From a paper:
Filamentous inoviruses such as [name]Φ are a genus of bacteriophages consisting of a single-stranded DNA (ssDNA) genome that is surrounded by an α-helical capsid, resulting in rod-like phage particles up to several micrometers in length but less than ten nanometers in diameter. In [name], [name]Φ particles, after being secreted into the extracellular milieu, assemble into filament bundles that promote cohesion between cells, thus promoting the formation of biofilms. Here, we present the electron cryomicroscopy (cryo-EM) structure of native [name] inoviral bacteriophages isolated from [name], revealing significant differences to previously solved inovirus capsid structures. Our structural data on the biomedically relevant [name] phage show that [name]Φ is a class I, C5-symmetric bacteriophage with dense MCP packing.
We estimated the helical parameters from two-dimensional class averages and employed real-space helical refinement to solve the structure of the [name]Φ MCP to 3.7 Å resolution. The resulting cryo-EM map reveals α-helical MCPs packed into a tubular arrangement, with an overall diameter of ~62 Å and a central pore with a ~20 Å diameter. MCPs are arranged with a pentameric (C5) rotational symmetry around the filament axis, with a rise of 14.1 Å and 42.3° rotation per subunit, establishing [name]Φ as a class I inovirus. Each MCP of [name]Φ adopts a bent architecture with significantly higher curvature than what has been seen in previous inovirus capsid structures, showing an angle of ~45° between the N- and the C-terminal segments of the MCP. The first six residues of the MCP are poorly resolved with smeared density in the cryo-EM map, suggesting flexibility of this region. Consistent with past structural data on inoviruses, the MCP of [name]Φ contains numerous hydrophobic residues in the central segment, which form an extensive hydrophobic network through tight packing with other MCP subunits around the filament axis. The C-terminus of the [name]Φ MCP, which is exposed to the phage lumen, contains three lysine residues with side chains extending toward the phage genome. To ascertain how bundling is mediated at the molecular level, we inspected our atomic model of the [name]Φ MCP and noticed that the N-terminal residues 1–6 form a surface-exposed segment with a prominent hydrophobic phenylalanine residue (F3) in the poorly resolved, flexible N-terminus of the protein, which is followed by further hydrophobic residues 5–9 (sequence AAAI).
Author numbering:
A (entry chain 9), B (entry chain 9), C (entry chain 9), D (entry chain 9), E (entry chain 9), F (entry chain 9), ...: 1 to 51
Write the structure that this text describes.
């Protein structure tokens, strides 16, 4: 009857495409860790196979 | 007696096949997130197994 | 006395076996949605476990 | 006799299609919460499977 | 008739957008735990694959 | 009306930030095990590749 | 005529906003339990995936 | 009028904070099992990767 | 009122600490298998690296 | 006038605190079943993840 | 008054402790299947890692 | 009263021990695949380490 | 006075213990379906984890 | 009195054992999909571990 | 009575065997990625073992 479906259907989507920011931010604060270990793993990794 | 069953039975269905749009839209605003993490996951994933 | 029980008892049933049509129609206008999400869910689902 | 059925039948419906607004508003004040947790859930979720 | 629908419809929403605070707070008091284990999991995790 | 939301919202969080202790304790009583095996794994691990 | 509606309408509400206390109290005596199990669940949960 | 709300509201809570005991007891009689398997799982687990 | 909580709370636990037996038994009938393969795996494993 | 309220009010309660017995008994004859399946579930559960 | 509570309370329990039999039987006719797959899974599983 | 529990309890089990056949059949039509790859994997596997 | 209570009280019960038959029959015509899907679910289920 | 219980009790079951057909059909139109992905998953899966 | 079960049972299946297309398409847009990394992985992989 009214059909206020798509009008609010975009409104809702716009609240939550403007939410990637958080996932990227917590992203960055994953990698710093994953590098820290990874880069530290690769430190000894060569000098395992130094032999 | 009257049998206004199918006539309105389509009417009702037409209000709600015209509702996928919202589910697609909130769809798109799922994937952007899921890529963001996923693509960021695959970033470190190769360079876990860099070794 | 009169026993107009089964005669109208079928009459009533015939108004309402001719009512499945609506339930099928609103059926179809469920699945289009459920696919939309489901198929979109399966989109990212493989590429979660891409790794 | 009078048949003031549809005339007021619309009148009543118009009081209550003009009621979605509230359901949308309490809608918005659901999602902010559901994001808050959800986005915070996804925060640790990647870094469960950091490994 | 009166149509005090949206006026109180916002009033109700404002009681409950001012409720995220609790969900964030119990949020923080989830992560401290989830880090505690997670960070402690990652402690041994590298030195599983020390080999 | 009353709005005793944040006041108890902190109260609840304080019961459960004071819960990490247990997770750390069961933490310690994970690692002792994980070392035991890990350190015992590394015992033979060098003297696999003694050759 | 008299219109002693709102005057007692508040009176009634005040008997029953002063009732949250009980729901909070039985609240606390839910969580102690839910922690007990939850914290005990998380005890073995890490050391399932110790592997 | 009487307002015997909090007085019995504590009374009820005290019947059911004195109920954790059972949940801890059935707790202990979970872990013995979960260890039994877990410790037995870790038995073969090292000597899978003995190689 | 009655407070038959801990009395039956132990009763229930005693039915189910007397249940480890089964988990140990199905334990033994895991390892026989896991040895069978494992010991058979280690059979060829040395004589892969015989070279 | 008479006020035979609490006198019979206890009388009634005493008929029905002496009713837990049945609920415990049908309790026991739940768990035997729930163990039977549960313990049988845990039988194959380890040897799913035997791998 | 009569207090035919425990007398029938056992009667009811005895109908339904004599019901485990079915759950064990449908038990056996689970495992035969679960072995069939499991044992067949373990067939190829070694000879994945044959290498 | 009637106690038609075990009589049908076997009847049900017999419908579903006569169901392994399907699981074996879909079994066979797993392995043909798993061999195909596995045997093809082992083809190049030796002639990786031909050197 | 007459006390034709238990005499008809059994009569009524005998009409409706002779009613399980239907519930078993509609039982069988549940499982055939539930197997059909279940057995078909287990078809792909192994060959999800074929990997 | 009449006892038209089993006579219609079969009638009802026969409407709904003649319903598996649909569940098999929607079955087939599950697997085609599940293969499509699965077979496509196994495509890259070998050539992950090509190395 | 009507038995419009298989007639619509095919109708439903035909909406969803005509759905593989999407899963193949999102398929292709998995592999391009998986190659990209895989082929790039194999780039350095030989020249790890160049030695």
């Amino acid at each position: 009857d009214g059909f206020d479906a798509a009008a609010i259907g975009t409104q809702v989507a716009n609240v939550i495409m403007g939410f990637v920011a958080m996932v990227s931010a917590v992203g960055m604060a994953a990698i710093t860790v994953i590098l820290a270990i990874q880069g530290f793993k690769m430190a000894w990794s060569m000098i395992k196979s130094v032999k």
